[PDB]
Ligand binder design. Structure first.
Ligand SMILES: Nc1ncnc2c1ncn2[C@@H]1O[C@H](COP(=O)(O)O)[C@@H](O)[C@H]1O
Ligand SMILES: Nc1ncnc2c1ncn2[C@@H]1O[C@H](COP(=O)(O)O)[C@@H](O)[C@H]1O
Lengths: 812, 807
């Protein structure tokens, strides 16, 4: 009897919660094919005036009334699928919100109508004027949705919003949300304009302020390439930077919004990578609001994590508004990714095309409704449509709440139009240097050090005191000290980067007592730059994108990304190709990201030998990047400081050393640190009688030391060996300084560890030629060309190293 | 009591769903759910003695006392196996799983038990033997991987599986190679001693071998891979589709893909998603692959993206592992979908780990207790195995040397690029074919624009009209499948063509159906298949497919070349370098649409220069065909030569419709692929002051300008094949200009892109001793192309003009 039935009703409430969404009126076309637990009878009833307890269903209700309420709640225009989430209080939170809506009022409804009108009217104006649809029609409700999202952010103390989307709807969002001048857009179509090489109109970002009741929000819409889905981790990178510059930096204060298409989101693996990474300390941003523009489920990746998915019918702006707040409230409340599945169509399987043509547009559907509610007449709707058309004709901003940015919002202005060779405060006063050298070498006794580490630290105290030369790690960390000391923050990010893949850095010290850590660079003085090191793992495409976004938002911070080995960075080729190396020219976007790519031929094989130097060199042009191969601790130290101290903001690609990290000749003095500078080139270091010199060898990086040791060994005085430490921009001045004593030499050799089709030969040939004397010939010494970067077998490597070295040194 | 009956059913359902959160899974035990408690469901201790219907609980003792149902539920769902399956939507699947798990579980006989012990002993033994001799990425702590795979292989044999394809990574690799695949311990030992193309590290080696099971011989193929994690997965799956495509009897139990993943890598690499999402598609699907996660410490939740049953199992219990292995196989065989096994284990190379006994120890003990095998038994296993290692010969009893017919590559192994191949086709037959594939049954009702394209093609067959690019290209496929050579075309919109040039597939506007004329040439033809595509997994898959099947012409087409960098890892680590690293040949064709036409930085450049820079030691071909004839001969060459190396094509966009880019029947029937093309206009050699060389669409710009100018003193020559560089061909086309001293290389692409920097050194080789060589083309740039059309247009006109401007 009735005991048993009460239990059955609970089971029925439950089934609606779980799966009600699958019978929801989501599709605006009504051609969706809904494929159980949902009819009473499967749960054995008939009965509808029997009164029941209704469990947690936001006390007592006649049955048939409950079934009403459940169908409303879970089977109308919103499909909440949300009971996979394990947090009890989150579900209950949601239930509370949806299981109890107030009505919007005449002015909010009208306003919805107004934004649908703009959505449509812009799409139509552009159709008529420029018959060449990435039109938003009809996912028109995106405009009302974004505008509401932003208003709600305002009223919840959000200060900035960062957006990334793609092409569909792009022009609409630009004009009707971000506030770009229609006239500016119309001009773009006519070919009226930038002073780089540019990109197409659908990749355009935009920055503005937007006035809400709750205050002034900053809007930032990303630039992006045609490659789908990769702007995402760029955005959230962007937002971590912006959070990192607030004084108490709570997530709700910067909101990331990403807009996706159904196919891209299931089909692009950077989505997985991004979800995985947003979990990680040093990368989290308190969750992203993800909008899926659902045309042709797809949101099913959002269960690899576990996030609420709100599906909604684009044809109901009111339901759309409601879900918008719901999703936003949820994310600001619980610091978690949320998904809004915006279910719509492309006005622009010819069986549904016919469906679409006979279907009224969202503006139309809504104005008809506001008319059968006596909230706006035809004459009202019609005049919204006339007003908007007129405004387009006038060409001015059409977003009433757009405000021009304040001076203080222009964070990049100091950093534009600088050249690589500008002067910068290279020197640091010896007293202060040693003071810092000593502080970062000195670990409170509280911290129990592992044995090998404690040694390394004893060494660095001895470097500080002049009693021992700096190695790479000692000098590198000293660079960071000198930067944070004067207020410049550092962010270092990479696989195992706190200690170092090669055990060289030990910026972070693992306590053997507490199991905690201590990071010396964080304890210099009150009010220093922050210093933060973050250990990635994998997700390498998403990570570099993130750091690119970060460096892009924040030019005051020295932002470093370190690949385990350079060989792996091709996992991020799209970032390197579409953003880092080309973003300035395409988009005007500066970036001082530093990339540490361990690189060097040491016999460990094809994926542990080559950063593919040559690929970065071919990408170089128009001063776009710097490519450096530092050979000394002093060099790395000056190199990093230059990047921070010196105005320009352009990617620094570094061929980082592995074995040089402990080479006994790779070693530097305090005098070289304090009074030295970054040297684009380094001349011959030994005494040779220049009149006796028959050959100059030029080279970069570790192979230098092999040549040096071999030439000393041979007792040889007739061949000089010069380093080129910066291959791009190519340092002509420096080159003529180190070459002047050799004006009379006719035999010049470029020597490289790397194979002929690789390293610098093919790309930097023409520079070498510009720089050697008018007489001189120029020839190659190095490994033969090869399909694989590096041979498999150590004995073969060793023979090749010896052979290329002897060949360089051999004048016979 | 009616009420309690409903609630006992909910209790069962709770265990089905969530039992696994309380299963004994962590070997270490160093690892609370209200649903799992009878009290949660309003049942009491005193209820335990009462008896209930147990609905579908598959036991099937069809009513039980509750106390006892509870013992069973726990013994089923909270023992050494954790089953997550109830999130799957398919009733029959869930019922199927219930039938096999809720039953029972698992009685193994003494012969099998001792075989497990034996296999664990091998796993432990090899790893200690290596550790002692060469002080490795040891399997230790997941020794059960070994009996698992051997059982997987045995069970597949009894299932009529004929091939197994595995990819995995570094942990456990030496062990699998030796104790599963059959590599001789001596070979491994030599390798550690550096007694040995350019090669690669031992942890990347793959291996082929045959394996005698009770059910039949089974071929095993373990993939080569680079240091990069997880990208070998889609490669294996491609391999499998190829193996399935060569069966008369294309049943999917017949070939089994297995991928072995780490838990970090499985959630941190995007290819997993990409591969999971591609395995749904026609035809990249292969009837499901079984995925083993080697879990050291959830990482498996990515399989709910695709709604895969997931079996967790305690690696210290080899009988658990075996049962789950069979179950997984049977499900994949049965329902043709992916399945995950989560092997819960630990890395032996810290306090709790060190006084934890090895899995050999634990199971030897347990067989003692069971009087199935004694200290002395177990011990002699250890000693027999160490002795075997000392002798250095195969330690896999079931190993067998492969049959001649398993050597599918031996014909293709040692070939040069300029080898003679059967270029000519007899005119009668070309025309017969051209007519066949352009004639469509009248039942098929074509969209008007496609109908017009097809009439043009009938005109082309007849000689009325010169071939355009799509005409010739389709005709190439037709000539190959004609003679029994299969074709696989894979790419975005590749059926019709991104640029609407192909129309290999016709969409019948009446039936909603399709018709593909290349599939209807004659019975016994090569299969022709075009598939419409997750770029990185797709390319990886096509590569696997080509390394498996050298008889099929396998073509991948990017939507635009600019996007292929999405797949840089496949290019860098497999396609370009596999032959030298691994001895792995591959005739994969890549169509990369490429051309400066003013559509911006991502619709302009395939990055020719990046492929050029990867070229060395004859690894690849890079071609820029300028004619329908040329594309036709290029594709036929690739298929008809014995060489199997990647062919990277700069594929045209505009040229697809350029009025001058057309070709005659005579050029198709009696021509051949020309690595270089000479001056084509009547031009007096002694009038010529300058020779311009170039490739691809620029040619036509230069030609059309030169003709406008009525210029006779500048010859223009195409290099169609840029690598390997065609020295003989270039001499024939430059001979009549031996006296010219002014040579220009001219390219659309910016100065630091395209061919200039990489091919320079070839160019200087091949022009006359007197002669100078200078560049005409776009200036260097950081973006591949400008954002604005007008600027594009000026740049095009200027480089063309510069190149033609003599004195
Ligand atoms: N990485 C960058 N390079 C150059 N300008 C930028 C960069 N980031 C932001 N800006 C400009 O600075 C202002 C504030 O940017 P945002 O805070 O990102 O909206 C806007 O004018 C941006 O165009
Ligand atoms: N792509 C390839 N290149 C060269 N040899 C291959 C290739 N694929 C398979 N083989 C060899 O052919 C035999 C059978 O290959 P499989 O069927 O992959 O086990 C083994 O000897 C393989 O080494």
């Amino acid at each position: 009897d009735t005991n048993v039935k009460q239990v059955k009703v609970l089971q029925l409430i439950n089934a609606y919660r779980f799966r009600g969404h699958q019978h929801a009126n989501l599709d605006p076309l009504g051609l969706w094919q809904q494929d159980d637990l949902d009819p009473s009878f499967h749960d054995l009833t008939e009965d509808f005036q029997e009164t029941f307890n209704v469990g947690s269903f936001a006390e007592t209700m006649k049955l048939g009334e409950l079934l009403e309420a459940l169908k409303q709640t879970y089977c109308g225009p919103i499909g909440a699928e949300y009971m996979h989430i394990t947090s009890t209080e989150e579900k209950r939170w949601i239930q509370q919100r949806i299981e109890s809506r107030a009505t919007f009022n005449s002015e909010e409804k009208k306003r919805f109508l107004s934004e649908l009108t703009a959505a449509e009217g812009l799409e139509r104006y552009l159709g008529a004027k420029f018959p060449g649809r990435f039109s938003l029609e009809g996912g028109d409700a995106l405009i009302p949705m974004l505008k509401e999202m932003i208003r709600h952010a305002g009223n919840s103390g959000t200060r900035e919003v960062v957006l990334g989307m793609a092409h569909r709807g792009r022009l609409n969002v630009l004009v009707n949300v971000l506030g770009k001048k229609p006239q500016d857009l119309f001009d773009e179509f006519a070919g009226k304009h930038h002073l780089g090489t540019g990109d197409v109109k659908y990749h355009m970002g935009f920055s503005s302020d937007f006035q809400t009741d709750g205050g002034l929000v900053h809007l930032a819409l990303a630039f992006n390439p045609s490659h789908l889905e990769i702007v995402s981790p760029v955005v959230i990178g962007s937002v971590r930077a912006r959070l990192d510059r607030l004084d108490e930096p709570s997530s709700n204060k910067v909101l990331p919004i990403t807009i996706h298409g159904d196919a891209a989101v299931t089909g692009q693996g950077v989505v997985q990578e991004t979800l995985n990474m947003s979990k990680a300390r040093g990368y989290e941003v308190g969750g992203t609001v993800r909008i899926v523009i659902n045309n042709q489920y797809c949101t099913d990746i959002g269960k690899m994590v576990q996030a609420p998915i709100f599906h909604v019918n684009a044809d109901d702006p009111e339901a759309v508004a409601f879900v918008t707040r719901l999703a936003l409230d949820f994310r600001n409340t619980f610091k978690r990714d949320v998904f809004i599945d915006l279910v719509c169509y492309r006005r622009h399987q010819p069986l549904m095309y016919q469906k679409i043509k006979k279907h009224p547009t969202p503006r139309k559907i809504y104005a008809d409704k506001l008319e059968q509610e006596k909230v706006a007449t035809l004459e009202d709707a019609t005049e919204m449509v006339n007003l908007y058309r007129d405004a387009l004709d006038a060409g001015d901003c059409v977003v009433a709440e757009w405000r021009p940015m304040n001076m203080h919002s222009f964070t990049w202005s100091p950093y534009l139009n600088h050249e690589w060779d500008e002067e910068y405060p290279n020197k640091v006063e010896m007293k202060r240097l040693q003071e810092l050298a000593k502080r970062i070498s000195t670990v409170p006794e509280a911290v129990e050090m592992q044995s090998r580490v404690a040694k390394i630290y004893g060494d660095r105290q001895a470097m500080a005191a002049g009693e021992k030369l700096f190695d790479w790690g000692g000098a590198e960390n000293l660079a960071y000290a000198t930067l944070v000391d004067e207020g410049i923050p550092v962010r270092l990010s990479g696989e195992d980067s706190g200690r170092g893949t090669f055990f060289h850095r030990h910026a972070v010290i693992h306590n053997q007592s507490n199991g905690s850590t201590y990071t010396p660079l964080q304890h210099i003085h009150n009010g220093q730059g922050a210093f933060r090191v973050w250990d990635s793992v994998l997700s390498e495409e998403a990570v570099l994108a993130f750091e690119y976004g970060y460096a892009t938002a924040e030019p005051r911070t020295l932002t470093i990304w370190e690949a385990q080995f350079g060989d792996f960075a091709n996992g991020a080729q799209v970032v390197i190709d579409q953003f880092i190396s080309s973003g300035e020219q395409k988009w005007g976007r500066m970036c001082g990201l530093v990339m540490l790519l361990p690189h060097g031929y040491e016999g460990q094989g094809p994926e542990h030998s080559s950063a593919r130097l040559e690929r970065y060199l071919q990408l170089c042009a128009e001063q776009n990047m710097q490519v450096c191969v530092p050979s000394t601790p002093a060099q790395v130290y000056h190199m990093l400081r230059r990047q921070a101290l010196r105005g320009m903001r352009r990617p620094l690609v570094v061929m980082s050393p592995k074995s040089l990290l402990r080479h006994p000749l790779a070693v530097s003095s305090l005098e070289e640190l304090a009074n030295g500078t970054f040297l684009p080139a380094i001349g011959e270091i030994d005494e040779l009688d220049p009149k006796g010199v028959k050959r100059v060898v030029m080279c970069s990086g570790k192979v230098y030391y092999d040549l040096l040791e071999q030439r000393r060994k041979n007792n040889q005085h007739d061949v000089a060996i010069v380093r080129i430490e910066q291959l791009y921009p190519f340092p002509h001045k420096a080159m003529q300084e180190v070459l002047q004593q050799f004006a009379h030499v006719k035999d010049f050799v470029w020597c490289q560890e790397e194979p002929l089709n690789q390293g610098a030969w093919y790309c930097s040939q023409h520079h070498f030629r510009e720089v050697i004397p008018f007489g001189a010939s120029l020839r190659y010494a190095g490994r033969p060309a090869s399909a694989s970067p590096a041979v498999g077998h150590m004995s073969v490597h060793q023979k090749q190293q010896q052979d290329l070295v002897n060949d360089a040194l051999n004048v016979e």
